[PDB]
Amino acid sequence: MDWHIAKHYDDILYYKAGGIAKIVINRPHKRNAFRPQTVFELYDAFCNAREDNRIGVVLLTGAGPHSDGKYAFCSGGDQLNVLDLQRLIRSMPKVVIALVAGYAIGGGHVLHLVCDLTIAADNAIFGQTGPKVGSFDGGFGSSYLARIVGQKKAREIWYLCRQYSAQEAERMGMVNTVVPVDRLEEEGIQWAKEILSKSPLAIRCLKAAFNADCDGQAGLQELAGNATLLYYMTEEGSEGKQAFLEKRPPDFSQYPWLP
Template sequence: MHSEASQVASETMQSTANRPETDSRPIHWEAPADARYQDILYHQAEHIAKITINRPEVRNAFRPQTVRELIDAFHRAHMDPEIGVIILTGAGELAFCSGGDQRIRGHEGYKDEAGVEHLNVLELQRQIRTLPKPVVAMIAGYAIGGGHVLHLICDLTIAADNARFGQTGPRVGSFDAGFGAGLMARTVGLKKAKEIWFLCRQYDAQEALDMGLVNTVVPLAELEAVTVDWCRQMNRLSPTALRVLKSAFNADTDGLAGIQELAGNATALFYTTEEGQEGRNAFLEKRAPDFGRFPRRP
């Protein structure tokens, strides 16, 4: 008769056997000729888009132009049927994003080149949240203030072991009472979210992992390799299933009614498609499904 320890060991071995092997092949990023920006970088490879906030001299703080370029880049990835997953990151090893550039903060927002004051980062938040493809935050260094909210909005977060997280709003006369408060509470719990906002403390990567703020912590030298591996794994899955699941998670979190009916209808419709039948047929025929032949619709 097997002992409890033997049963646990057997289940662990079975779980490990079912886990996909890490794909450590190098990725060769390319910058499309028509994707030229001043404050960000746009690269793509293997059905993955990588969007990089490129202002390391200010710890990748954003200004209105940065946000406009991010909105354009995310729209590009959204509409590209060759892109299945999107990475959001910051240039260098010191910061993912440190929030809004306080040097250009005016009385009503952040000043653009014409002196008009904006809070257009709120539009970017909504765009990332509703974009029907997974968005992965790849974080090295600081994710602070508005940058912290940006990673929170992303579907998954992979953090380097040098990452630091926190909100600074009340310290600089600012706050995010939308996703920054509500989604934070749903992610880490109400009491912890209040601590993060009311005390403006910083948390290291392990603390962020322990509170459920990030998905995994990896050595800095392995950050991109692990992130790309996760993206490759998602790109091997059904793009329509991922799309519907993302909208379902958001609908539930946003408190929309009728989520179960939505899910039932979506599943019934999906079963009628060739893509849904490919997964069933591959299982019955004991072969790997060929999901690569199905479009990643914008």
């Protein structure tokens, strides 16, 4: 659709159209690797998307192709940190969809993993690099990967640091669907619109519920936090707000203790 520029950044591009935001890593001369400035700007853009009551879905992608003809989603750290960014993407009450063309490698692979969903172009290439280049992500990069592809495949991914095609990535369970390169944005927009027709409260509650299977008390904070928000929107929940407004004690005596 007719995207409009939402904010200006050095290392990324940021657009909105209706209920969809699009965040584009824009360092194709570095295979869309993030430097600290890029992490800061990504974090800032995702915060903005979080603040916007109109935005229900964020598409995350890399600018491409580069002038060498190759595509990259994100190739990781360029040789707030990315852990802050991982947490924001994971916990924000909007659905984030990674649209991966070409390389999603290293820190860039973990970025795709922590997005709710991933749509891959058929030229996409996935994998980790840490043990080969001198790093590791033993956080969401390991445990959460295992909750997606299972323990055997997740260990293989990290120990060997091989590259995996889009088809292999879908088969192992870490990519939701694969489409041609020229259909990638359209597919992302279609999936976004399907989500945008849903109940925003139901969606945010489900996202918290999925996090709660992984994130212990931090997941409980998100899930219970949503319960509190819902409570505020009930008749019983509003008795507190109005009892104070009229300067009287709150009275919950008329409310049932449901089974």
